[PDB]
Design a protein around this ligand. Structure first.
Ligand SMILES: *[C@@H]1O[C@H](CO[C@@H]2O[C@@H](C)[C@@H](O)[C@@H](O)[C@@H]2O)[C@@H](O[C@@H]2O[C@H](CO)[C@@H](O[C@@H]3O[C@H](CO[C@H]4O[C@H](CO)[C@@H](O)[C@H](O)[C@@H]4O)[C@@H](O)[C@H](O)[C@@H]3O)[C@H](O)[C@H]2NC(C)=O)[C@H](O)[C@H]1NC(C)=O
Ligand SMILES: *[C@@H]1O[C@H](CO[C@@H]2O[C@@H](C)[C@@H](O)[C@@H](O)[C@@H]2O)[C@@H](O[C@@H]2O[C@H](CO)[C@@H](O[C@@H]3O[C@H](CO)[C@@H](O)[C@H](O)[C@@H]3O)[C@H](O)[C@H]2NC(C)=O)[C@H](O)[C@H]1NC(C)=O
Ligand SMILES: *[C@@H]1O[C@H](CO[C@@H]2O[C@@H](C)[C@@H](O)[C@@H](O)[C@@H]2O)[C@@H](O[C@@H]2O[C@H](CO)[C@@H](O[C@@H]3O[C@H](CO)[C@@H](O)[C@H](O)[C@@H]3O)[C@H](O)[C@H]2NC(C)=O)[C@H](O)[C@H]1NC(C)=O
Ligand SMILES: *[C@@H]1O[C@H](CO[C@@H]2O[C@@H](C)[C@@H](O)[C@@H](O)[C@@H]2O)[C@@H](O)[C@H](O)[C@H]1NC(C)=O
Ligand SMILES: *[C@@H]1O[C@H](CO[C@@H]2O[C@@H](C)[C@@H](O)[C@@H](O)[C@@H]2O)[C@@H](O)[C@H](O)[C@H]1NC(C)=O
Ligand SMILES: *[C@@H]1O[C@H](CO)[C@@H](O)[C@H](O)[C@H]1NC(C)=O
Ligand SMILES: *[C@@H]1O[C@H](CO)[C@@H](O)[C@H](O)[C@H]1NC(C)=O
Ligand SMILES: OC[C@@H](O)[C@H](O)[C@@H](O)CO
Lengths: 211, 221, 284
C-alpha cells in the first residue's frame, strides 16, 4: 500500500492547479487531502474525494478516476503555496497511508540575485589550530543555488558543509556555506574562493591569508 | 474548543528510549481513536500508529513495529507513545491526531513535539569574531559578525549589544555538519564611520549546555 | 494464518427468548415415501421448544456493541436467521476451538462454500471483512480474520454458496457416528421478532465424513469496513440485521406426514401432549 503524487506543481496566480494522487488502493476506498504550510499542523481540505469542510472555500474541488484522485484549486492565490498530501486507509482498517506530498509553488515572483559575503578565518580561530571560511548568501530567489569552493584555482574536494536555502522574512532566500581547513592549508595557498551560481549567474568572492 | 497538546519531545542518543504524551481536551476522549503521525524535517507525512477508543486494538506502521508502543489513559484524557530502540531515522516532529468518528481521516491535530535522534553529544559552541569588511556592503557601511561553530543540540540565540542593536542584523540558519554538530553565523551591517567609536558585541546563548559567550568584534589591524 | 481483532465490547448484548412453534423438522433420511404417515425416533427440535434470539452486533448515538458468543452444541443445533444482508457466512464447530483439537470451519462467500477440518487456533472474535468498492460500486471481500494458524488438516470440501441471496434461513446440524449432517430451508416471511407459525421441513444439504467431537460452535459474521474505525461510533452501517436464533435438538419420536408427492406437510411430536401420544398410538 503506497500513494504516489508528484513532488512539485507550479501554477500562476488565478490559474487552476491540479494535484494528482495515484495508487491501486485508490480504486477501492476514499482519499483525503490535506494542506500544510511551513511550521504548522496539516489541515483537512478534502474528504471522501470531493467533500469540503465548512472552513474550506469553494475554490477547492476534489475528483476521482480509477486509480487516481485529483485536488483542483481554481483561483490560485499566493496564500495557497503549500505542501498538499493525499491520504487513504486499507480495507481492514489496520493501516493509514500518506502520499509523498506535492509542493505547490505560486509563480510570479521575480528572480533575485544573491548577495555574497565571504569572511576569512579569524586570528582567534587560527590560534585554536582550526580554520573556517564563511560564505553567506542572501536575498536570492528562486531558492536554489550551487556553491563551489576553490583553493587557488583548483576546486576543493572536501571540508565543505552547505545549508539548504531557507525563506527569509522578506520571502527571499538565504543560505550559508562553510569550508573547514587546517591553519597550514589556509596559509599554504595564495587564496581561497567561494563561488555561488544562481540561475546561470555566478558571484565569486575570494579571501587571502595575507590580510 | 477541541485541543490536543503534545509533550515529551527532546534530544536523545540512538538506542535510547523516550515517551511522548498528548493531553486532550474539549471532546469525549474515550469515544475517539487516536493516532500518532510523524514528519522528518524536510520530508513528508508518515502514519505511525493508531489506538482504538478503548485500547482494545493497536496498529503500527512497519517502520516502527516492535519498537514503538501506543497506549492511553482515558481517565487522564492522555495518549502516550513509547519509543524504544530509537534510530536516527525516527527524527521527526510527532503529531497527535484524532480519528474522525465514522471515517478514515484525521479531523484534529496537535501542535507537534520535536524528537531528535543523534549520536552527537551535548556541546557548547566556540564563538569567533568576524572582523568588519566593507567589501560586500552598501556605501559607507561595513558588515561584521560572529561565527558560532560546532555546538549541539540546536538552538542557540544571538543578540547584539544585549539587544540594543537590531537594525541590519541577519542571523543565518545553522548548518548540520557531517560531524553531527551545528554551526551558524550572525552578521550585522553597521555604519563604517561608527567602527572606531561603537563597540560591537554579540551575545550567544546555548541553553542546552548552559553556555553564554559575549564576544567583542574589533576591526582588523 | 492471519492477525486477529478484538471486537467484543465490555457492554454485552442481551439475548431474547421465543418458541420454536412447529419448526425444525427435516427429512431424517433419503428414503422416498408417498401418501403415508411414518414414525421415526431421532434428534428433532421438540415443538414449542426453548429458543434463544441473539443479537451479535448493534449500532445505537451510534455506539458500537459486539457480543457474538460461543454456544454449546449438545445433541444437535437448530439455527435460523432473517437477513437479506448476507451477514451470516458460516460457523465454527468443535471442542476447544484452539490448536489442541480439530475443529470444523464452514465459510460462505459470493463464489463458493469452503469447509475445512483442521487444528485451528481461532481468534477470540472471528469474522470476515467486506468493504464497498467505490469504482465497481459494489461490496467485496476484504480479509479473513478467523484464525491465527491452522495445521494437521484432514478434510477440505468446496462447492457452491448456500447463504448468499423477508427471507428466513433455517439449518439443522447433527454430529452422529462420524458424520456432520446439515439440513436447510429458505422461506419467505413477513415476521420480524418471533419465529413464524407454519410448517416447512428442511431438505438434506450435505453429510460430511468429518469424525470429530463437537460440543461448541460460534457463528461467523461478515462485517463492513465501516465498523472497523478506531472510534466507538459506526455511522456507516445499519447493523441491526445481524441476529440469529438457536435451539437444540432432542431425542424424540415424531410422526411425519408424506403427501402423494413425497413432501412432508405435517408432523406430530408424540411426547408433546396426550393428544399427540394418542395420534401416535393410533398411528393415524
Ligand atoms: C405432484 O406432482 C404432479 C406432477 O408435477 C410434476 O412433478 C412435481 C413433483 C413437480 O416437479 C412439477 O413441477 C412437475 O411438473 C403435479 O401435477 C399437477 O397436475 C394437475 C393436473 O392433473 C395440474 O393442474 C392442471 O394443470 C393444467 C396445465 O396442464 C398440465 O397438465 C396437463 C394434463 O393433461 C399436462 O398435459 C400439461 O403438460 C401440464 O402438465 C391446467 O390447464 C389445469 O387447469 C390445471 O391447473 C397441476 O398444475 C400440476 N401441478 C403442478 C405443480 O404443475 C401435482 O400437482 C403435484 N402435487 C402436489 C401436491 O404438489
Ligand atoms: C487483542 O487483545 C490481546 C489481549 O490483550 C489484552 O486485552 C487488551 C484489551 C489489553 O487490556 C491488553 O493489555 C491485554 O493484555 C492483545 O494481546 C496482548 O498484547 C499485549 C501487547 O502487545 C501483550 O503484552 C506484551 O507481551 C510481551 C510478551 O509476549 C511483552 O514483552 C510486552 O512487554 C507486553 O507485556 C500481551 O502478551 C498480548 N496477549 C496475548 C494473549 O497475546 C492483542 O495484541 C490485541 N490485538 C490488537 C492489539 O489488535
Ligand atoms: C471465497 O473464498 C475462497 C476460499 O478462500 C480461501 O479459503 C478461505 C477459507 C480462507 O482461508 C482464504 O484466506 C483463502 O484464500 C476464495 O478462493 C481462493 O482465492 C485465493 C486468491 O485468489 C486463492 O489463492 C491463490 O491460489 C493460487 C493457486 O494456483 C496461487 O497460485 C496463488 O498464489 C494464491 O495462493 C485460493 O486458491 C482460492 N481458493 C479456492 C478454493 O478457490 C474466493 O476467491 C473467495 N471469493 C471471493 C469473491 O473473494
Ligand atoms: C431456556 O429458557 C430459559 C428461560 O426460562 C423461562 O424464563 C425464566 C425467566 C423462568 O420463568 C423459567 O421458569 C422459564 O422456563 C433460558 O434462561 C435458558 O437460557 C434457555 N435455555 C436454552 C438452552 O435455550
Ligand atoms: C500434526 O499432526 C501430528 C500427528 O498427530 C496425530 O495425527 C493426527 C492426524 C491427529 O489424529 C492427531 O490427534 C494425532 O496425535 C502431530 O505430531 C503434530 O504435532 C501436528 N502438528 C502440529 C503443528 O501440531
Ligand atoms: C471493476 O470493474 C471492471 C469492469 O467490470 C472489472 O474488469 C474489474 O475487475 C473490477 N475491479 C475489481 C477489483 O473487481
Ligand atoms: C468424542 O468424545 C468422546 C468423549 O465424549 C471421546 O471418547 C472421543 O475420543 C471423541 N472423539 C474424537 C474423534 O476425539
Ligand atoms: O430426503 C428426501 C429427499 O430430499 C426428497 O425425497 C424430498 O422430497 C425433498 O426434496
Amino acid at each position: 500500500y503506497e500513494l504516489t503524487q508528484p513532488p512539485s506543481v507550479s501554477v500562476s496566480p488565478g490559474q487552476t492547479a491540479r494535484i494528482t494522487c495515484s495508487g491501486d488502493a485508490l480504486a477501492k476506498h476514499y482519499a483525503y487531502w490535506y494542506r500544510q504550510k511551513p511550521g504548522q499542523a496539516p489541515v483537512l481540505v478534502i474528504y471522501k474525494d470531493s467533500e469540503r469542510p465548512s472552513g474550506i472555500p469553494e475554490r477547492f474541488s476534489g475528483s476521482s478516476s480509477g486509480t487516481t484522485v485529483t485536488l483542483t484549486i481554481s483561483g490560485v492565490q499566493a496564500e495557497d503555496e503549500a505542501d498538499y498530501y493525499c491520504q487513504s486507509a486499507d480495507s481492514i482498517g489496520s493501516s493509514w497511508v500518506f502520499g509523498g506530498g506535492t509542493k505547490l509553488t505560486v509563480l510570479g515572483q521575480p528572480k533575485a540575485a544573491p548577495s555574497v559575503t565571504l569572511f576569512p578565518p579569524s586570528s582567534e580561530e587560527l590560534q585554536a589550530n582550526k580554520a573556517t571560511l564563511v560564505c553567506l548568501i542572501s536575498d536570492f530567489y528562486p531558492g536554489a543555488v550551487t556553491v563551489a569552493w576553490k583553493a587557488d584555482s583548483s576546486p576543493v574536494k572536501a571540508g565543505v558543509e552547505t545549508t539548504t536555502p531557507s525563506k527569509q522574512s522578506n520571502n527571499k532566500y538565504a543560505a550559508s556555506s562553510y569550508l573547514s581547513l587546517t591553519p597550514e592549508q589556509w596559509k599554504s595557498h595564495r587564496s581561497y574562493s567561494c563561488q555561488v551560481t544562481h540561475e546561470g549567474s555566478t558571484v565569486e568572492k575570494t579571501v587571502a591569508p595575507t590580510e | 474548543e477541541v485541543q490536543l497538546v503534545e509533550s515529551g519531545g527532546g534530544v536523545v542518543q540512538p538506542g535510547r528510549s523516550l515517551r511522548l504524551s498528548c493531553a486532550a481536551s474539549g471532546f469525549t476522549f474515550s469515544s475517539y481513536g487516536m493516532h500518532w503521525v510523524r514528519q522528518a524535517p524536510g520530508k513528508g507525512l508518515e502514519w505511525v500508529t493508531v489506538i482504538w477508543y478503548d485500547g482494545s486494538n493497536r496498529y503500527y506502521a512497519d517502520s516502527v513495529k516492535g519498537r514503538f508502543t501506543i497506549s492511553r489513559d482515558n481517565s487522564k484524557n492522555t495518549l502516550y507513545l513509547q519509543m524504544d530502540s530509537l534510530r536516527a531515522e525516527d527524527t521527526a516532529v510527532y503529531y497527535c491526531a484524532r480519528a474522525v468518528a465514522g471515517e478514515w481521516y484525521f479531523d484534529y491535530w496537535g501542535q507537534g513535539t520535536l524528537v531528535t535522534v543523534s549520536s552527537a553529544s551535548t556541546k557548547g559552541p566556540s564563538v569567533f569574531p568576524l572582523a568588519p569588511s566593507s567589501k560586500s556592503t552598501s556605501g559607507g557601511t561595513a558588515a561584521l559578525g560572529c561565527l558560532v561553530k560546532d555546538y549541539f543540540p540546536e538552538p542557540v540565540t544571538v543578540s547584539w549589544n544585549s539587544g540594543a542593536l537590531t537594525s541590519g542584523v541577519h542571523t543565518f540558519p545553522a548548518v548540520l555538519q557531517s560531524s553531527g554538530l551545528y554551526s551558524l553565523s550572525s552578521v550585522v551591517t553597521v555604519p563604517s564611520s561608527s567602527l572606531g567609536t561603537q563597540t560591537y558585541i554579540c551575545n550567544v546563548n546555548h541553553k542546552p549546555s548552559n553556555t553564554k559567550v559575549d564576544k567583542k568584534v574589533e576591526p582588523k589591524s | 494464518g492471519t492477525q486477529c481483532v478484538n471486537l467484543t465490547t465490555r457492554t454485552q448484548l442481551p439475548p431474547a427468548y421465543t418458541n420454536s412453534f412447529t419448526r425444525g423438522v427435516y427429512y431424517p433420511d433419503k428414503v422416498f415415501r408417498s401418501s403415508v404417515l411414518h414414525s421415526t425416533q431421532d434428534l428433532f427440535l421438540p415443538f414449542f421448544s426453548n429458543v434463544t434470539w441473539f443479537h451479535a452486533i448493534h449500532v445505537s448515538n451510534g455506539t458500537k456493541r459486539f457480543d457474538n458468543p460461543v454456544l454449546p452444541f449438545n445433541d444437535g443445533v437448530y439455527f435460523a436467521s432473517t437477513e437479506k444482508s448476507n451477514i451470516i457466512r458460516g460457523w465454527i464447530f468443535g471442542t476447544t476451538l484452539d490448536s489442541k483439537t480439530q475443529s470444523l470451519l464452514i465459510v460462505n462467500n459470493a463464489t463458493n462454500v469452503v469447509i475445512k477440518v483442521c487444528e485451528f487456533q481461532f481468534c477470540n472474535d472471528p469474522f470476515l471483512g467486506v468493504y464497498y468498492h467505490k469504482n465497481n460500486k459494489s461490496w467485496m471481500e476484504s480479509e479473513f480474520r478467523v484464525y491465527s494458524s491452522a495445521n494437521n488438516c484432514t478434510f477440505e470440501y468446496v462447492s457452491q454458496p448456500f447463504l448468499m441471496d423477508k427471507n428466513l434461513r433455517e439449518f439443522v446440524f447433527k454430529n452422529i457416528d462420524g458424520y456432520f449432517k446439515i439440513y436447510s430451508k429458505h422461506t419467505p416471511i413477513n415476521l420480524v421478532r418471533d419465529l413464524p407459525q407454519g410448517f416447512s421441513a428442511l431438505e438434506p444439504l450435505v453429510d460430511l465424513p468429518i469424525g470429530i467431537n463437537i460440543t461448541r460452535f460460534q457463528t461467523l459474521l461478515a462485517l463492513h469496513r465501516s465498523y472497523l474505525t478506531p472510534g466507538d461510533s459506526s455511522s456507516g452501517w445499519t447493523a441491526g440485521a445481524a441476529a440469529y436464533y438457536v435451539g437444540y435438538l432432542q431425542p424424540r419420536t415424531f410422526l411425519l406426514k408424506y403427501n402423494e408427492n413425497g413432501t412432508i406437510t405435517d408432523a406430530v411430536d408424540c411426547a408433546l401432549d396426550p393428544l399427540s401420544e394418542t395420534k401416535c398410538t393410533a398411528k393415524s
